[PDB]
Amino acid sequence: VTQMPRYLIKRMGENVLLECGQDMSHETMYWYRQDPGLGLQLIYISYDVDSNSEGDIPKGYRVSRKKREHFSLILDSAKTNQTSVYFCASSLGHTEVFFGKGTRLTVVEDLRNVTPPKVSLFEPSKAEIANKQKATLVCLARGFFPDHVELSWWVNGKEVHSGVCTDPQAYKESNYSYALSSRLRVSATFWHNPRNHFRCQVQFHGLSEEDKWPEGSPKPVTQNISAEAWGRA
Amino acid sequence: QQVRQSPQSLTVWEGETAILNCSYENSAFDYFPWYQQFPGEGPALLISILSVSNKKEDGRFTIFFNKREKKLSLHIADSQPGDSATYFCAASASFGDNSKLIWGLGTSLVVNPNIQNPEPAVYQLKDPRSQDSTLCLFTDFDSQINVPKTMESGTFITDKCVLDMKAMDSKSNGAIAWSNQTSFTCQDI
């Protein structure tokens, strides 16, 4: 199993570090990048300790393997075009290549454009309960810039997955603003029960503790913004 | 273009067999792994075959190989909505270490569920926390219905999204529409 940091926000111009690890003590490791829309692209290859070779697009990248179990990717100067999902890859006995969960890296020109999302919850149509005998909840997050949001539904304190359908990609509403939506659908009976609590949580990943920010404004750190509701009628 | 997958986009109904094609030009290739990648996740090896072989089977998944034609194909028998994802085909030569896998551009697969007796209706929802906020919802429509896209500069429509409730095996479709304008009905779209 290979692991790596999930989300990261960095300004353009300064150094960036990505790390990767494995517990099978094999030899060959890889670094891939993939734009959210289409292509999977190779950056660098490490065959063993201190044995690295350029990939298809090594330009703007450099690597370091001082130990077999770990592989670090280094960006000395972050660029705007270097915004994609980065995948560390690994293989043992050349029969199968393992990929990690990926790291979503977003490089911004100005950190001040980073804003948390505005989460709104819409109550189901009365006609829906009337005609379809069921109630659909709809959550909507807007006003956020990095696509580092994770939407989840919570009923009575427990995360549910059944009856949950979230949009796969955030929509570009403005130049520095995105929008994301999702829906939850339960029976009219369950919605008519006032003891039922519904909550739409959106997890936003922002800046770390070690970041520079003005004092007259709230620092957009990693946080959760949610919208709740209760059973009616 | 060393590894060419086809088609560029594939959409099937559930139960049907999905067929993903791929071709190459270099006779050096002897190893062809297929990687499955679910949205928001990394690629994982699903099934692989060697050029010395003619067919590889693993459960509902099967690889057909033509060395003379330098073509191969992945068949997903009794396809389920669960296996709907983007599928990548890779290629290697010696199949030893530093194999240098040549990746195909991948094929996005979507497996639509058979919904019996669809009841397509549009409902308008409301956010109590903020008044005069209109939301449109299209649901229970059939899967072959193509959701219309429109650029009104201020109006946004989401892609269709298949929903699954654990109660009473019956899948459902859904679509979302909204606008920054205070007054607009969902009836006309």
Residue numbers in the entry:
A (entry chain B): 3 to 235
B (entry chain A): 3 to 191
Q: Which sentences did the original study use to describe this structure?
A:
Superposition of the α- and β-chains of the liganded B4.2.3 TCR with their unliganded counterparts reveals marked changes in the disposition of the CDR3α and CDR3β loops, with little alteration discernible in CDR1 and CDR2 or in the C domains as observed in other TCRs2224. In the structures examined here, CDR3α, spanning Ala95 to Lys102, undergoes a large conformational change upon ligand binding, in particular a 9.1 Å displacement of the Cα atom of Asp99 of the first molecule in the asymmetric unit of the unliganded TCR compared to the same atom in the liganded TCR. Resonances from several residues within the β-chain CDR loops, CC′ loop and FG loop were absent in the TROSY spectra, likely due to conformational exchange line-broadening, suggesting the sampling of alternative environments on a μs–ms timescale. This is consistent with the multiple crystallographic conformations observed for the same residues among the three TCR molecules in the asymmetric unit. Mapping of affected β-chain residues on the X-ray structure of free B4.2.3 TCR suggests that the α/β-interface in solution is in good agreement with the crystallographic interface, and is dominated primarily by contacts between the constant domains. These NMR data are consistent with analysis of the X-ray structures of the TCR, which reveal that the Cα/Cβ interface has nearly twice the surface area as that of Vα/Vβ (1216 versus 698 Å2). In particular, Tyr125α in the unliganded TCR interacts with Asn133β and Lys134β in one of the three molecules in the asymmetric unit and has long-range contacts with these residues in the other two molecules. Notably, the H3 helix does not participate in any crystallographic contacts in our study.
A key step in T-cell-mediated adaptive immunity is the triggering of cell-surface αβ T-cell receptors (TCR) by peptide-loaded major histocompatibility complex (p/MHC) proteins on target antigen presenting cells. Whereas antigen specificity is dictated by the amino-terminal variable (V) domains of the αβ-receptor, signalling function is mediated by the non-covalently associated co-receptor CD3γɛ, δɛ and ζζ dimers, which bear cytoplasmic immunoreceptor tyrosine-based activation motifs (ITAMs). The B4.2.3 T-cell hybridoma, derived from a BALB/c mouse immunized with P18-I10 (RGPGRAFVTI), is sensitive to picomolar concentrations of peptide presented by the MHC-I molecule, H2-Dd. To gain further insight into the dynamics of TCR/MHC interactions, we employ complementary biophysical methods to examine the high-affinity B4.2.3 TCR in both the liganded and unliganded states.
